Structure 1
Amino acid sequence: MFYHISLEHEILLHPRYFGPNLLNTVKQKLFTEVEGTCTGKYGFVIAVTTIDNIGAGVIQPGRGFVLYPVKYKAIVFRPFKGEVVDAVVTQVNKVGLFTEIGPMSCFISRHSIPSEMEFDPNSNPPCYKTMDEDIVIQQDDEIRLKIVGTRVDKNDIFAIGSLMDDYLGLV
């Protein structure tokens, strides 16, 4: 889930970037570094809302690099377990369904799909269709899925969705 939290990061600034625009360079380099990355403990980071305080630049006494601590208020999405979450199915395959929840890519496995749904290999657009045809699962549809569990690999989170519980799927 999404949280606007203060976070600590450390930046090694090279001596070429001193002079004016130093702190602006630190801001820009923080934005280049933290954005576009996921972590296991705090999930994805979407963007830095602001910088709370730039710490004192300590000179490392063998290098000339300057270590800057930065407190920064940023928005992070942390996928938690045991939550109904809104999702958009992005890819539909035989083995499972891929959905997007913000930055996160959730994988609904074939066993986790209810047994009332069956893959449609006879349709040119592949889909999971119900035995009675009350919901059709294709790409780009608004569903509500339960997170079975968050699983982290290479500091990138992919979770498992389920539709077994009531009030889930297409509504």
Structure 2
Amino acid sequence: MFYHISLEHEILLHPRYFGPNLLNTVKQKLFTEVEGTCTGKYGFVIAVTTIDNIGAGVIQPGRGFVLYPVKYKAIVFRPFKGEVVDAVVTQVNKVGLFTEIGPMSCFISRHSIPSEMEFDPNSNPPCYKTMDEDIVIQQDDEIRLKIVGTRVDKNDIFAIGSLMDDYLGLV
């Protein structure tokens, strides 16, 4: 889910960037540290809108690196537990559907998929189709799923979804 937040990040600036208008270097540095990363607590930081203010630069003793506490406005993608959201299928395997909820990738287990669905390896491309053939989930298909739980791994958020709940599928 997308939100508007005001976060705090301590920027480490080398003394080499102590030239004229050093605040510009701090401002542009913030567009690389917190931009494009994925904090485990607030989720993926997809983009930064604007900068609120830049705090006083405190010089760390011994290290010699000036620390600049800067406040900025950014939009994060935090998948809340037990939240239903649309997803895009990227690949399909016998284990289960592999979905893509925006920046992150969510995996759907075979058990979570309704029993009526049955994986078909012969059909090109693979797609979880039930016997009645009423609903089929191909690749790059807009499907709605509920995230039962989310886990944070290697500075990234991995989500597990399910379609057992009512009205979860192609619609």
Same fold at TM > 0.5 = yes
C-alpha displacement at 1:15, in angstroms?
Answer: 1.1
**Structure 1 runs, 4 residues or longer, greater than 2 Å off:** none
CA distance in structure 1 between the aligned counterparts of 2:157 and 2:60, rounded to whole angstroms: 34
CA deviation vs aligned residue, 1:9-28 (integer Å, no higher than 9, x gap): 01111111112241111111
**Identity level (%):** 100
SS of corresponding position for 1:24? helix
CA distance in structure 2 between the aligned counterparts of 1:103 and 1:33, rounded to whole angstroms: 17
Q: Mapping of 1:86-165 within 5 angstroms?
A: 86-165=86-165
The answer on whether the counterparts of 2:125 and 2:139 sit within 8 Å (CA) in structure 1 is no
C-alpha displacement at 1:100, in angstroms?
Answer: 1.2
Equivalent pairs counted in the alignment come to 171
C-alpha displacement at 1:2, in angstroms?
Answer: 1.2
TM-score, normalised relative to structure 2: 0.95
Name stretches of at least 5 consecutive residues in structure 1 with no aligned partner: none
SS of corresponding position for 1:170? coil
The answer on whether the counterparts of 2:82 and 2:149 sit within 8 Å (CA) in structure 1 is yes
SS of corresponding position for 2:123? coil
SS of corresponding position for 1:23? helix
RMSD: 1.1
CA distance in structure 2 between the aligned counterparts of 1:60 and 1:24, rounded to whole angstroms: 21
CA deviation vs aligned residue, 1:32-72 (integer Å, no higher than 9, x gap): 11112112211111111111110001112323311100111
CA deviation vs aligned residue, 1:95-117 (integer Å, no higher than 9, x gap): 12111111111000011111111
TM-score, normalised relative to structure 1: 0.95
